[PDB]
Design a protein around this ligand. Sequence first.
Ligand SMILES: CC(=O)O[C@H]1C(=O)[C@@]2(C)[C@H]([C@H](OC(=O)c3ccccc3)[C@]3(O)C[C@H](OC(=O)[C@H](O)[C@@H](NC(=O)c4ccccc4)c4ccccc4)C(C)=C1C3(C)C)[C@]1(OC(C)=O)CO[C@@H]1C[C@@H]2O
Ligand SMILES: CC(=O)O[C@H]1C(=O)[C@@]2(C)[C@H]([C@H](OC(=O)c3ccccc3)[C@]3(O)C[C@H](OC(=O)[C@H](O)[C@@H](NC(=O)c4ccccc4)c4ccccc4)C(C)=C1C3(C)C)[C@]1(OC(C)=O)CO[C@@H]1C[C@@H]2O
Ligand SMILES: Nc1nc2c(ncn2[C@@H]2O[C@H](COP(=O)(O)OP(=O)(O)OP(=O)(O)O)[C@@H](O)[C@H]2O)c(=O)[nH]1
Ligand SMILES: Nc1nc2c(ncn2[C@@H]2O[C@H](COP(=O)(O)OP(=O)(O)OP(=O)(O)O)[C@@H](O)[C@H]2O)c(=O)[nH]1
Ligand SMILES: Nc1nc2c(ncn2[C@@H]2O[C@H](COP(=O)(O)OP(=O)(O)O)[C@@H](O)[C@H]2O)c(=O)[nH]1
Ligand SMILES: Nc1nc2c(ncn2[C@@H]2O[C@H](COP(=O)(O)OP(=O)(O)O)[C@@H](O)[C@H]2O)c(=O)[nH]1
Ligand SMILES: [Mg+2]
Ligand SMILES: [Mg+2]
Lengths: 430, 430, 426, 426
Amino acid sequence: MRECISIHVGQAGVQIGNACWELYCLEHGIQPDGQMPSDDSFNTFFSETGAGKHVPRAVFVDLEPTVIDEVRTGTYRQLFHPEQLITGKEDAANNYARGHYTIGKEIIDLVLDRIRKLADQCTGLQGFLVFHSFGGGTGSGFTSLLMERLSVDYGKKSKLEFSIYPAPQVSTAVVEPYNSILTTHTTLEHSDCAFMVDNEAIYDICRRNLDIERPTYTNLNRLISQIVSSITASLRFDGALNVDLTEFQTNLVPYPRIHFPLATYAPVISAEKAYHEQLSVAEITNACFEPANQMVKCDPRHGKYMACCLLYRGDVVPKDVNAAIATIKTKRSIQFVDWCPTGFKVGINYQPPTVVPGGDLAKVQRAVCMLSNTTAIAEAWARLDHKFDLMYAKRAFVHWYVGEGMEEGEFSEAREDMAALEKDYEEVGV
Amino acid sequence: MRECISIHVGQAGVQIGNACWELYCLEHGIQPDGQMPSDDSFNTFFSETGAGKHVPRAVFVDLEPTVIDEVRTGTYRQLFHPEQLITGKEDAANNYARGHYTIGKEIIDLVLDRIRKLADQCTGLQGFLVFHSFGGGTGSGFTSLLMERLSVDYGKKSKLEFSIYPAPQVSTAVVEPYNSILTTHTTLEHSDCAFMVDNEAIYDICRRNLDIERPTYTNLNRLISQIVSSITASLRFDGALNVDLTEFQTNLVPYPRIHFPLATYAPVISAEKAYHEQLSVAEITNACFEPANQMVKCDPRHGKYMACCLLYRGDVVPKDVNAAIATIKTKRSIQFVDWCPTGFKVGINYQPPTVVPGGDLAKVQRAVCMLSNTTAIAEAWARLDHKFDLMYAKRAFVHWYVGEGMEEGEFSEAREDMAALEKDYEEVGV
Amino acid sequence: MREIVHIQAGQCGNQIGAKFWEVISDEHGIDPTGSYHGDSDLQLERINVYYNEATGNKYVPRAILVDLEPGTMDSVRSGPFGQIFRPDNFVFGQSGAGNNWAKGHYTEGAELVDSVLDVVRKESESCDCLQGFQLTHSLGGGTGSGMGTLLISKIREEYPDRIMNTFSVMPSPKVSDTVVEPYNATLSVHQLVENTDETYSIDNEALYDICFRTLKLTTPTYGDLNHLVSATMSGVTTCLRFPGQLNADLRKLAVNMVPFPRLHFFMPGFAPLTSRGSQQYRALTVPELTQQMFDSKNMMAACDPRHGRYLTVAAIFRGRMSMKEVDEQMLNVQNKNSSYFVEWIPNNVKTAVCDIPPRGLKMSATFIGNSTAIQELFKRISEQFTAMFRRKAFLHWYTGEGMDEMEFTEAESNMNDLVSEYQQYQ
Amino acid sequence: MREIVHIQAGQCGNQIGAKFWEVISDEHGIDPTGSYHGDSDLQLERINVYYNEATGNKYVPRAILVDLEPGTMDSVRSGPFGQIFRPDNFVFGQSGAGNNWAKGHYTEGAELVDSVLDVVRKESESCDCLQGFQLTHSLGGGTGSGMGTLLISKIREEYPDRIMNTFSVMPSPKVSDTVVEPYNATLSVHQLVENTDETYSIDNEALYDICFRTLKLTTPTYGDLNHLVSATMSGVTTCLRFPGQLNADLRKLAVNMVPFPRLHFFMPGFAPLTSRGSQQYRALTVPELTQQMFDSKNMMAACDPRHGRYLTVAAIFRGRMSMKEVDEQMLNVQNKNSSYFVEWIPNNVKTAVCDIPPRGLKMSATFIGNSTAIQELFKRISEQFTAMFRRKAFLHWYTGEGMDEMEFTEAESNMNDLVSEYQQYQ
Ligand SMILES: CC(=O)O[C@H]1C(=O)[C@@]2(C)[C@H]([C@H](OC(=O)c3ccccc3)[C@]3(O)C[C@H](OC(=O)[C@H](O)[C@@H](NC(=O)c4ccccc4)c4ccccc4)C(C)=C1C3(C)C)[C@]1(OC(C)=O)CO[C@@H]1C[C@@H]2O
Ligand SMILES: CC(=O)O[C@H]1C(=O)[C@@]2(C)[C@H]([C@H](OC(=O)c3ccccc3)[C@]3(O)C[C@H](OC(=O)[C@H](O)[C@@H](NC(=O)c4ccccc4)c4ccccc4)C(C)=C1C3(C)C)[C@]1(OC(C)=O)CO[C@@H]1C[C@@H]2O
Ligand SMILES: Nc1nc2c(ncn2[C@@H]2O[C@H](COP(=O)(O)OP(=O)(O)OP(=O)(O)O)[C@@H](O)[C@H]2O)c(=O)[nH]1
Ligand SMILES: Nc1nc2c(ncn2[C@@H]2O[C@H](COP(=O)(O)OP(=O)(O)OP(=O)(O)O)[C@@H](O)[C@H]2O)c(=O)[nH]1
Ligand SMILES: Nc1nc2c(ncn2[C@@H]2O[C@H](COP(=O)(O)OP(=O)(O)O)[C@@H](O)[C@H]2O)c(=O)[nH]1
Ligand SMILES: Nc1nc2c(ncn2[C@@H]2O[C@H](COP(=O)(O)OP(=O)(O)O)[C@@H](O)[C@H]2O)c(=O)[nH]1
Ligand SMILES: [Mg+2]
Ligand SMILES: [Mg+2]
């Protein structure tokens, strides 16, 4: 019942998985060895065997072994099914071309084989939680090949998309927009609701809120895990208003192509800071709409809200939710599209947030998960399109994509598709 | 209910805050850590969290960090919300110019942000208690920038002004009148009732009454705190005649521009001196009108009283107040304007004054707070205007103000405005 | 697993490669006799990248030592780590090349290319998954420049898909030790551009500039220049021998670093670099590593980057550090110095970070740069070639080997073509 | 946080700056090796103002040592605190200036200005929030007066907004040790007035007068004059390195102390000053500090303030004192001596108080004064210049360096202009 198969592609995907399962084993009380010391709250994410062992339903796919066989050496080496974590021989070279045609071709058939052997025990499979990065070669090419076959083998099943998106300023590779643009066909055609992750915005989040001067990506991971667990909170624990994963995405999505909502989490706050605040429902409600708390470097005040979903968890009373949202609709600075004078979807869960012992996040009795679609997010693509022009105008690095079996015009279809998406997110704002 | 947001700008403002909160935590019985060992008498000044902690609603703003990060090291480092005490990078250089256009520009937006996050928990916000110094660069420029935006974001809310005013003889900087004159537009347009503080007059007070030969500014602070607490006494404790903060300023103000009353406190007396006097209500009433007890070096006998407010606290019977004020109106040496044959506003509070353990003030069962507007105070500006001429006649230090983005004619508007104020306080005396 | 097969050409190549072998044997904790002596298991998983597993848990490097003289083989086998090498890969002639490119490419090295190919092929078949060939040689003289290009062409012909990265020490005007270097350099880069996927240009003069003006050595010998080369030698391949947060193997660099196929002669560099009496005072923080890294003094060629524009730069960091400051310096460098980086391509930097720093170092940074200013050495080599080309000196010692004038003309034309492309995008 | 970057020019400048470094290293409790050894944390928070944090919790001062001879560098590095300095900031030539301003400003120092600029820029970028540059030099001779003005002009050009304060020991008639000083002083103040926001004039004769007639030293050496300079050196920047009730950094002084932009040559002084056998008897109370402070004997130039009017005076007090007596003396001095202070500007004093007194002192007072009487040294320098200008001596040793007569004429005209402005408001 209510099972979800999590897919982890690329270095970013596999390591964000390492952090997510680190959070899940703690919140559901499983040791790193898979045992339960002493409700079926784990059936959503973990499978059970006769010996009392919790086996996650997850696949780690990387075209290179270093990160995954590092996982084979870490504390979670025995938690995972060893041959459901698949390693390739040749890295993706930050190239969508080989990852989509050349190197992922020989390995994808085993990946779908393991997906099938994960699906056949799920009696109530709810959806898919695939993790990757746009800029990475694996996270672009292999995901592009994989959602294609998943959409024809599991077409009815929902496919939530949690992807890591490049920053306006911070970047790790010059070819990142090339990998990002050929991913856009996958999210538009073979995804049901995509969640985009910006590293620089959350860098600002941890700089300002967590007061930590020197966090790593592991600190980024130990909050992406919270956002995904909060999205999955209603499926695993009891709540006064439990939101089904299908109910969720029906509430987000106004049109089949408009399914790209922003995400924010509250309260992101350090342990030294949690003490001096009462941390009411109202202020965590007010903090979410603050542009200084957005996960993507775009100003919501530059845009218009279409769908709003209040995913509260912990000791939160729905009356306080109504009182907060009355204030939210009271201010004019937050102007919603003329589509939704009802505005808000409310979801409340009884489980307080679970704290990572090595994390930088404080223990708070209340936590809220904010997921909202808005027209302001097109700016996060409005710099990437001008960016892609700035390379494609000479055919900057295409000889590699051409040399690995990509048609030259696939870039033309790519920027045509992103232009279509950018237009689609502008007409709905009128 | 009945909350007031206190603003502290400049070195003088932040340190007078350090003394005021030192007095408030003692009188309301809060430890320096914010806890209550064991009525909602603290709701006027302190906010409460779930863990039983009292958090003041105050902002320390200084364009330089030394005094505030000294507060971050003092005994009250944990009492205050650390990022509601805002520090800049560049000092104000005793210059209104940079403080009003250049250096305070980048920091004021955070200051109003924190003011908003202090306003949103105040359910019954009564007014603002901003502290600064006229002569200081920060206390002039940043306050001038701040009341401008507060008057448009909190226009209805009262804004009491407690400012430290230069002496006729004692001075610490040559540019002090320059900073003081550009402050006059703020008090006239963006203040509701300003309270002016002279260091030399209160130097004479502590020399004569406290018998202390060698006090510091901390002794000045441990009586400015008493005057402000006595003004706020009715809002926090019970009294037979409690005077609302709006009631107070309605009783002070005859005209929108005549809102500049003097202040005196009685009984200012040393511990060795408290023993030999019975200290009746009459003598503390008589001591307040004595020019040797005025807070500003101006002779009230040189001027005419318009509004009189008797803010008694402690074991005082209102009959004795009436008996005292009958004697006050009996003598001719105290001549009130033909506006107010009713003369006196009476306010009585049941809380005796709270003594600082390290202070130089005696413990007295009775205390009275004297606030009165009079035409004699124009002399405190009648030497500052002739003073400002004595510098502006060559353009003495204007190249700095010009060099930091001030219009040269802003001095012309400044002395035109002070001349208008000086005239306004003379016609009403006829 | 991504095995990498090393080839040494010329005395310069084999001695600097031998010192590289010494360095990475210390990094992997390999005894001079070949046995393992490292401390952590991290030195052990990717031994297959550079060494072959043998009986007794001893490890033999996958290196092919090629020369036309036995004296250099005698010195290297008698060197500090001579005993660890394969006796079979000591493939060598007897008569030297005499700094003659034609000798090495037609007569002296053509007879030994058969004896080097049967060794490189067996080394490659000994690999589980070959990634490429790292070849060390010198553009000066006729051994390293001469036979090196021939066997590079052969291995490229029979291995068309594997990565081809070469580290080339190349001639210079003021520290020239041989008269006939420019002929050798022009006849070598002709094949280097057409065949190699990667070429690192190393100039001796800037190595000297590093050891005096940064390292403050009074007598830095030739081995110190070898050390400076070997630092980046080990740095460029760090990601596929050790775990790190951002893994970037050779082809990861390649896909990010060479915008057009022929623009693959690059700028190596390494940080930190201090004198003996100044390391005690330096703060080794990553921002300081960066400010040292893009300095024109830290580079290993005379081509000053301020005379051109960077096409792509690769900064493979190493050590237990976070990375937001990494991004902030990598954007600040290209923002405040945007006039030194091609504005038309926005993010010129590839960032890689490794988790285990070098032994004795808390952190390290390896610099790889694509600047249009690298044409300074190419056009100067072409000009010096013209000063000894236009009216026929020294050609009897090439034409006597079957070499011909028109091939010299095409080599010069190709140098001019290269400098044309690299000035085109400046 | 308000970092301040120090530059030493000339032997006078670098030795007095070195002794200043010694003094404030003792104040901050810094070991000769550079490690911290202070007692309270108060010495530790504002270490960033003068020193750079490095590995091992040792601290290197932000000083750039500039000279045209290696002998002074040899002496300073072998001095008591030579080891704490940066080996890189020892930037120096070999041939000296020979007390020639033209040499330092055109030939000898122009080649080294590139090597000083790349160091001062790296020092400035190492700072978190730069406040200004404190530069020590001598108006005598051609090194300190010559290259000092050139590099001051350069740093002013590229740092237009930062505070520029210079402490200048300047020539004098009766204790003159070099023939050609007046040329140097006239060619130096020309740039000092136009570029510097702040200049402290120091005269050696009044230092001698202090050490005999107040300190009662029988043999006060040159280091004692350096000590007298360094006392005010440390005093003027006390407020931004330590807490005090009245904080007054350099720009706090500036906004209060220089009424018109060009009236920025000022009068330093320090109190208390006693002989060894008289400190036992003195009452160090603040009023006595004041009566000592405005004495004409306490000052460090021959310009007697009774021959002019004070424009602005700065009294940065230090120690655990109250301040009503501070105000009462600062008003009594300007009231009972109102004939010595410009009555047209009423409150001529800027008052600053620090909470931590100097080590071994319960309290201290630092004197900074703007008097129209400071023109005594300027007009006397102009007169001595005229006695060696009007009919052409020594000009061949300047004109041989590319120097020209008309620039000497403009320099003299500018000295006359300055003395005109300072006599105008007297
Ligand atoms: C006590 C102390 O801290 O001294 C350090 C050191 O950090 C200094 C002095 C070292 C030192 O290096 C040199 O003296 C040197 C001389 C000529 C050419 C190159 C280096 C050091 O020898 C080098 C050595 O570095 C390593 O061990 C690295 O792993 C390096 N391997 C070698 O240098 C090496 C030396 C002998 C045999 C085999 C290898 C390395 C660098 C990049 C990639 C792989 C390996 C270290 C930490 C030191 C000493 C010992 C003084 C420096 O070396 C490196 C490569 O980091 C020179 O500048 C750097 C940084 C420092 O100034
Ligand atoms: C036993 C005793 O009370 O002697 C005192 C002292 O007060 C006297 C003798 C000191 C003493 O100074 C001298 O003898 C001296 C000689 C030549 C030039 C200048 C000073 C003293 O050396 C100086 C020293 O002062 C300090 O330590 C200050 O912090 C000073 N630093 C130094 O003088 C210093 C000395 C060596 C190495 C590094 C610094 C300082 C002043 C201003 C700003 C920063 C630092 C003190 C208290 C004394 C002695 C030891 C005798 C005096 O010095 C100062 C600067 O206050 C000279 O006149 C003053 C006051 C006193 O007469
Ligand atoms: N937020 C976040 N982003 C990450 C993390 N790890 C990798 N990324 C993103 O991944 C992008 C680059 O992709 P890669 O590092 O190459 O990972 P990959 O998806 O496996 O791609 P390949 O290595 O080519 O196979 C970077 O721009 C990062 O934004 C992480 O831990 N947190
Ligand atoms: N009564 C009293 N006045 C004070 C106190 N502290 C400072 N002042 C006044 O402040 C005036 C000078 O302002 P500053 O000391 O520069 O303080 P500031 O307002 O922060 O101004 P800046 O330093 O330029 O930012 C003096 O003339 C004093 O009258 C105090 O503790 N008590
Ligand atoms: N950087 C460096 N350069 C060297 C070294 N040894 C020699 N060289 C120079 O590099 C050039 C290469 O020429 P060389 O290798 O002798 O020609 P070959 O014999 O035909 O291979 C020579 O002219 C030397 O001056 C070394 O150890 N390091
Ligand atoms: N106050 C003081 N004066 C000095 C000191 N040393 C030298 N002087 C004098 O200051 C003048 C400066 O000239 P100088 O520095 O030698 O010229 P430069 O070599 O071109 O920098 C000299 O004529 C000296 O007489 C010192 O330690 N303190
Ligand atoms: Mg990858
Ligand atoms: Mg201030």
